[PDB]
Structures are given as structure tokens and as C-alpha cells.
Write a protein that binds this ligand. Structure first.
Ligand SMILES: OC[C@H]1O[C@@H](O[C@@H]2[C@@H](O)[C@H](O[C@@H]3[C@@H](O)[C@H](O)O[C@H](CO)[C@H]3O)O[C@H](CO)[C@H]2O)[C@H](O)[C@@H](O)[C@@H]1O
Length: 260
């Protein structure tokens, strides 16, 4: 089937039956880790389902040799997601200096394997002083440049996560770095009782269609990934899958939305 190169899912796909269901409309997935779920090891998903897996270095706890070996043995992998929400204490929780210290290892992987670096994956944060992703990125750039005679860190794409209204405004703010984006988690989880709360499937479908239209349209958005395959409880009706190998109404909707 012809489908959007952009359209992904943020979910540890484990079942081949879940790929059948998703592959109609989904080009790619990731699972916040350097390798796909073990269940998929002896399945040619690239060839049968026309889906690719994008590996991720979640924080500085990195087996460089093992990742390099995997990437070199899988030359069709062209992108490496790096650093999952460093400015969130409940995620990578990396200071700007800690991320700058890791970065040369990631540049060496890029130089050795050809992969482009997609990250850090930013959000509005909880790390002291670094709620604003612009503050965190500015400090990271300054830390890296300090340690490398003024050179900026290699960033092929920035990544972004967003669970509210205003995702286009956040991309506009972050366009100050002059880098294109992957939006590697999104949904609308607004909860406050202000009229905008997403408390029905109809309202999540409405926001999914609005956000997908905008992401497909933007020339500086290469890829996006919906959160998520399955979750429970699911108060904002974010799940694309139900039983093994079965789409929800939202899943069927997502995979059939138009694209660029
Ligand atoms: O790599 C070692 C590193 O692993 C860390 O554990 C992470 C998980 O926290 C992460 O979990 C994902 C979340 O980041 C994301 O928000 O939601 C998804 C879906 O629920 C989670 O799977 O998954 C990755 C990959 O499996 C794990 O690396 C430990 O926190 C950390 O201390 C350790 O250094």
C-alpha cells in the first residue's frame, strides 16, 4: 500500500499481528530503546509490512559497541533517535553539561555508521531552571561549544513531544535553532475543565486530524509518531490498538488520514 513516509507510532510493537494492523498506514515505529522487541527478531518486517524501526539512545547509558554493530549490520537504518526528554526528571533527566558530555559518543556513532542524529527529544520540563526547552537547548549548545573550540553539536533534526494544544506554536518557537523536526510523541491530553479538555473519542479524533494535517503540511517536519499503541487507563482515548492484531476506531482513523 502507498502510505505517508512521515506517519509513525511511539509504541513497543511486539506482535507481528499488531504490525499487520498498523502497516496499512504506518511507515515507522520506535520503542525508546536501541533494538526492536525480541519477538520480531526472526521476521522480515521491512520487506513484508514496508515498516522500519528507528533505534533510540534514551540517555547516557549506552553500549556504544553493541549499537554500532547493530547499525552497521542494518545499513537501511539512516536515523538514530537520541536523548528522551532530558529536561524531565522522570525521563532522561540530563543536565545540559551531561548531554554535551554524551554528544561526542553520538557524533562518533554518526561518523562510523552514517546515521543522522534526531534529538534531543524536548518537551516542557520539570528539571530545575529548564522547564523551557529553549533554556535547556541554549545551555546544551553553549556547553558543547565550550568543550569543542566554539563548534555547535551535530543535530540533523530536533525531536519534540507534545500533549496539548499549540503544537504548531511550540515548533515555531523551536524553529529558532534552524533545524527540522521529528515529532516523536503527540496526542492531546488536555484535562483542565476550561472547555478544551479531551474527554471523548470524538475530541481526540478531532485533534488527531488537526495535528496530522499540520504535521503533514510542514516541510520542516520529517516524521511524527502518535502516542500510543495501547494504554490503560486511557482517559483521553489515545490507543490505536485493542485486542492483538485489532485497530481501535482511533487506529483505523489515524492510518487512513490523508498525507503529503
Ligand atoms: O537505558 C538504560 C536506562 O533505561 C531507563 O529506562 C527506560 C524507560 O524509562 C523507557 O520508558 C519509556 C518512557 O520513556 C516513555 O515515556 O514511555 C514509554 C511507554 O510507556 C516507556 O517505555 O523505556 C526505555 C527503553 O525501554 C528504557 O531505557 C531507566 O530509567 C534508566 O535509569 C536507565 O539508565
Amino acid at each position: 500500500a502507498t502510505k505517508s513516509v512521515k506517519r509513525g507510532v511511539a509504541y513497543d510493537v511486539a506482535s507481528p499481528a499488531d504490525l499487520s494492523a498498523l502497516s496499512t498506514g504506518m511507515s515507522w515505529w520506535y520503542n525508546w530503546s536501541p533494538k526492536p522487541h525480541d519477538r520480531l527478531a526472526a521476521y522480515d518486517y521491512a520487506g513484508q509490512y514496508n515498516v522500519d524501526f528507528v533505534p533510540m539512545v534514551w540517555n547516557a547509558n549506552l553500549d556504544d559497541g553493541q549499537l554500532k554493530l547493530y547499525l552497521l549490520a542494518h545499513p537501511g537504518i539512516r536515523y538514530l533517535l537520541v536523548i528522551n526528554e532530558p529536561n524531565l526528571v522522570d525521563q532522561a533527566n540530563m543536565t545540559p553539561q551531561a548531554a554535551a558530555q554524551l554528544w561526542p559518543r553520538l557524533e562518533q556513532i554518526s561518523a562510523q555508521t552514517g546515521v543522522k542524529l534526531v534529538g534531543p527529544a524536548m518537551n516542557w520540563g520539570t528539571m530545575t531552571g529548564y522547564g523551557d526547552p529553549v533554556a535547556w537547548l541554549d545551555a546544551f549548545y553553549a556547553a558543547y561549544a565550550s568543550a569543542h573550540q566554539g563548534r555547535d553539536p551535530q543535530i540533523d533534526y530536533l525531536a519534540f513531544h507534545w500533549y496539548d494544544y499549540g503544537l504548531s506554536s511550540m515548533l515555531d518557537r523551536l524553529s529558532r535553532y534552524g533545524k527540522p523536526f521529528w515529532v516523536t510523541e503527540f496526542a492531546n491530553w488536555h484535562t483542565l475543565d476550561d472547555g478544551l479538555q479531551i474527554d471523548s473519542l470524538e475530541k481526540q479524533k478531532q485533534q488527531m486530524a488537526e495535528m496530522v494535517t499540520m504535521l503533514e503540511r510542514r516541510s520542516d517536519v520529517f516524521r511524527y509518531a502518535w502516542f500510543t499503541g495501547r494504554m490503560t487507563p486511557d482517559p483521553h482515548f489515545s490507543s490505536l490498538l485493542d485486542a492483538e492484531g485489532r485497530l481501535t476506531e482511533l487506529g483505523q482513523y489515524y492510518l487512513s488520514l490523508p498525507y503529503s
